């Protein structure tokens, strides 16, 4: 049996978010808090649609992971060590599909991987330039006005 916890983050009303970005309105959305297992760590993701004029990350989708205080925290090791696979799923036709993803190794020396003293860790870990918005028109990443972001954690 597999051991990794996998969360599927459904971001709906995406067309609206894209419209805002195109009108130079900031877009930053947090995923609901989710667990990597039972017992497991509690995390949430933070996704940005950077402004079209954003210096150093114009028109880019940014994606980060943040640790949160979870109910199983007393039974887990700290700081967190392991890998986190972030994927924006291709919802294209039956034939071969090509998702957009990155895999990151946790850096135990960073505060992002410690348990926060408040519900959501201020410090997160991720990619400022995860995927360019232009990539969204290259494949069917948006389906039924929804974007699918997959987060797989391996301890």
């Amino acid at each position: 049996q597999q051991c990794n916890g996998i969360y599927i983050w459904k971001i709906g009303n995406f067309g609206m978010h894209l419209k805002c970005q195109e009108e130079e309105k900031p877009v930053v959305i947090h995923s609901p808090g989710f667990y990597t297992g039972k017992p497991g760590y509690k995390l949430c993701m933070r996704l940005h649609l950077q402004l079209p004029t954003a210096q150093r990350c114009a028109n880019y989708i940014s994606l980060f992971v943040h640790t949160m205080q979870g109910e199983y925290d007393s039974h887990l090791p700290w700081p967190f060590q392991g890998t986190i696979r972030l994927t924006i799923l291709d919802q294209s036709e039956a034939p071969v599909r090509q998702n957009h993803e990155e895999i990151m190794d946790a850096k135990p020396e960073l505060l992002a991987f410690q348990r926060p003293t408040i519900p959501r860790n201020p410090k997160g870990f991720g990619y400022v330039t995860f995927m360019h918005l232009e990539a969204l028109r290259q494949r069917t990443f948006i389906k039924d006005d929804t974007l699918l972001v997959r987060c797989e954690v391996s301890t």
Binding site: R46, F64, M104, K107, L110, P122, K123, G124, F125, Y127
Partner: peptide
């Protein structure tokens, strides 16, 4: 590239 720590 490599991921980075980012504060929000």
């Amino acid at each position: 590239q490599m991921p980075t720590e980012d504060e929000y």
